[PDB]
C-alpha cells in the first residue's frame, strides 16, 4: 500500500496525509445460464429448402416460436450466396435471445438487390418492400439461377411496379385494381391513362448478372419485447446462491448475488428494476421462481501514511464496508489491528484510549497521527484543556501584568 500510493499520485515521493487509491474488485467465479428444457426443433428448413416460394407483393409469412434451433448450419457452415446482418452481430446469433422470427420468402433479380437495406429508395424499396430504421434482423440470399430459371422466361412469379401512394411495411398487397392515371375509367383493362401495375420477371440464363434470380429470405428479430422462445443450445447449469458470479438470464447479463424475494410480483414478470433502473430481481426461465439480484464490488481503498523520510508504515482505511465478511493484499486483513469506525474498518492502526492533538484526519471524530518502536495510532481528537472557574457576584479579575504579542497573517492577492 506504500507502492499503491505512488501509482495513483504519479510521484516518486509521498507527503504526509490521507490519499485515495482505488476500489474493491471482486472477481466472479462461476457462470449461471438458466434455460428451459424444450425437446422441439425449430422448422426453419421448411421455408429455406422449399422449391416453390411466393412473390414480393404477397409473401409467405411464417411464425417460428417455442422451439430450439441451430445456427451453425445456417451461418458457420455456409453454402449460401449472400448472408448479411444489420442490427445483430452475425457471429453471436447462437448466443443472443429473441422472441419470434418472421421469414419472408421472395425472389428479387440481381440488379434490384441493392435496395434491400434500411432507409432505401427504389421500385421494390417503395411500393413493395420497405425496411424501417428500427428494423432488427438479418438477410439471407442464395443463387437460384441454375435451378429456377427458364429459357423462354419464368412467368410463374410477378411483381408490382406501380402504386398510388407509399406502401406501409410488413403488409401484403393482394389488390388486382388497375392503376388509373387520368380521369378515363380503365374498366379492368389497360388503355388511355391506364397502366398495368403487376408485371413479370426478366429471368433468363442468357442475360448478365443483373437478371439472375436470387432466393432471398430476410429474418426479423425482436429484442426485449417479450420473454424469449427460440434462443439457442448455449448451456444449462444449476443456480449458485449467495456468491458474486456472472449472470446470464435469458440473454440479459449481470453481476451479483442471488437472494430471496419477499415482494409480491406479477406471474408474467420476466424481470424488474430498482430506483437506479437496473435489474434488481429476475424470474427463472425454466420454472416460475424468483430470486433477487444484489450487485457486488462496492467500497473504496484509502491509505494513511506519513512521509517517505519518516517510515514505511501505511495504515489502510476501508470505506463503508464491514470487514467481518472478509486489492490482492491479504496481509493486513489477518486482524487484531481492526478498529470499527463509522466510515468503516481501520486496519494497520492500534487504537489508544488517550486524547491528543493529531495530524492526519480520518473522520467521524476518529483521528490518526504518528506517535511512539513507533507505529500509527488512532484516537479521538482533543478539544483543548478544560478549565473550571468559579463565578460569583463579589469577585472580579483585573490583570496586573501586560505583554505584547506579534502574530503573522498571510492573505493571497
Amino acid at each position: 500500500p506504500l507502492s499503491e500510493t505512488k501509482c495513483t499520485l504519479k510521484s516518486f515521493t509521498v507527503e504526509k496525509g490521507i490519499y485515495q487509491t482505488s476500489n474493491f474488485r471482486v472477481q466472479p467465479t462461476e457462470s449461471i445460464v438458466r434455460f428451459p428444457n424444450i425437446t422441439n426443433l425449430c422448422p426453419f428448413d421448411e421455408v429455406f429448402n422449399a422449391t416453390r416460394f411466393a412473390s414480393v407483393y404477397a409473401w409467405n409469412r411464417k411464425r417460428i416460436s417455442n422451439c430450439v434451433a441451430d445456427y451453425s448450419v445456417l451461418y458457420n457452415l455456409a453454402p449460401f450466396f449472400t448472408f448479411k446482418c444489420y442490427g445483430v452481430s452475425p457471429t453471436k446469433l447462437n448466443d443472443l435471445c429473441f422472441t419470434n422470427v418472421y421469414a419472408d420468402s421472395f425472389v428479387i433479380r440481381g440488379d434490384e438487390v441493392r435496395q434491400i437495406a434500411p432507409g432505401q429508395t427504389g421500385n421494390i424499396a417503395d411500393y413493395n418492400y420497405k425496411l424501417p430504421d428500427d428494423f432488427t434482423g438479418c438477410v439471407i440470399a442464395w443463387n437460384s439461377n441454375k435451378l429456377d430459371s427458364k429459357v423462354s422466361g419464368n412467368y410463374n412469379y410477378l411483381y408490382r411496379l406501380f402504386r398510388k401512394s407509399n406502401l406501409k411495411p410488413f403488409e401484403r398487397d393482394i389488390s388486382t385494381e388497375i392503376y388509373q392515371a387520368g380521369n378515363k375509367p380503365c374498366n379492368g383493362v389497360a388503355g388511355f391513362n391506364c397502366y398495368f401495375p403487376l408485371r413479370s420477371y426478366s429471368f433468363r440464363p442468357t442475360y448478365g448478372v443483373g437478371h439472375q434470380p436470387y432466393r432471398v429470405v430476410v429474418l426479423s428479430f425482436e429484442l426485449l419485447h417479450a420473454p424469449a422462445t427460440v434462443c439457442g443450445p448455449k448451456k444449462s447449469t444449476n443456480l449458485v446462491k449467495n456468491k458474486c458470479v456472472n449472470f446470464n438470464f435469458n440473454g440479459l447479463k449481470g453481476t451479483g448475488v442471488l437472494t430471496e424475494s419477499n415482494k409480491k410480483f406479477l406471474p408474467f414478470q420476466q424481470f424488474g428494476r430498482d430506483i437506479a433502473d437496473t435489474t434488481d430481481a429476475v424470474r427463472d426461465p425454466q420454472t416460475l421462481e424468483i430470486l433477487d439480484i444484489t450487485p457486488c464490488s462496492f467500497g473504496g481503498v484509502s491509505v494513511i501514511t506519513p512521509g517517505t523520510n519518516t517510515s514505511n508504515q501505511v495504515a489502510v482505511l476501508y470505506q463503508g464496508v464491514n470487514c467481518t465478511e472478509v486489492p490482492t493484499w491479504r496481509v493486513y486483513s489477518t486482524g487484531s489491528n481492526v478498529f470499527q469506525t463509522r466510515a468503516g474498518c481501520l486496519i494497520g492502526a492500534e487504537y489508544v484510549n488517550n486524547s491528543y492533538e493529531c495530524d492526519i484526519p480520518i473522520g467521524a471524530g476518529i483521528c490518526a497521527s504518528y506517535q511512539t518502536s513507533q507505529s500509527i495510532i488512532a484516537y479521538t481528537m482533543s478539544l483543548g484543556a478544560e478549565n473550571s472557574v468559579a463565578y460569583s457576584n463579589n469577585s472580579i479579575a483585573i490583570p496586573t501584568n501586560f505583554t505584547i504579542s506579534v502574530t503573522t497573517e498571510i492573505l493571497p492577492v
Partner: antibody
Amino acid sequence: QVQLQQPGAELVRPGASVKLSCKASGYSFTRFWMNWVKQRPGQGLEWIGMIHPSDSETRLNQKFKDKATLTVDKSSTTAYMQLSSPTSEDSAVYYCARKDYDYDAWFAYWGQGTLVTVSA
Amino acid sequence: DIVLTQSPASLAVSLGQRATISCRASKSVSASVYSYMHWYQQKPGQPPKLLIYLASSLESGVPARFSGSGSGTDFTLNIHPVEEEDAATYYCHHSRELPPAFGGGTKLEIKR
C-alpha cells in the same frame, strides 16, 4: 449415480486434530457447495459449516467458530473437514451432503456416515 | 435465526390411522410464493433421505403416503396409511435465515 463416500470410524484423543474425507463422484466438483451435518444421538442434527470449494470461502456457525477448519481438494474431487481440539461432547456422527440449488436449497445426496469417538 | 421446535417428542400411531407431527417456526419462512421447509426421514444406522420439498410437492422415489401441508409458521406432516416400515426419526429444516438451523426431531412408533 452421484454418491458421497466417507470412512466408517475415526479415533482421536482430545487436544489433537482429526481429519475427515468426503469423496464426490459422478458430478463436477466446483459446481456445487458442500455442507457438513453433525448428529449427536438424542439431541438431533446440528449444522457445522458450508464451504464454496472453488473459491475456498467458508461459512460457519457462531458456536462452532475456531473448532472446525474446512479445506478442499479440487484435484482429487474430495472435500475435507479438520477439527481442532475436540471434547467429550464433540463425539457424534458426521455427514457430508451436496446441496443442489434451484430456489430453495434441499439436501439431495448424503454420505455413508462417520462415527468419531473422542477419548484417550 | 429461526429456532424450530417440534411437539411431542414421541408419538405412537396404530396401523390404519393418520399421524400429524408439527414443526413450529419462530419467524415466517414464507417468501417468493414458495416458503422454505424440508422433511427428512432417518432410520438408525442409515443416512437420511429427501422426502418433501417446498411443502406442496413430492420427491420421486418417495411413496405417496408421505405428505405435508400448512402455511405461515404452523406446518403439518400428514402421514397415512401408517405402515410398519415407517418407524424412524423425522427432521425439519429451513434455508430462510443465514446461518440455517436444524429441528429437534420426533420419533414415531407403531402401537400394536
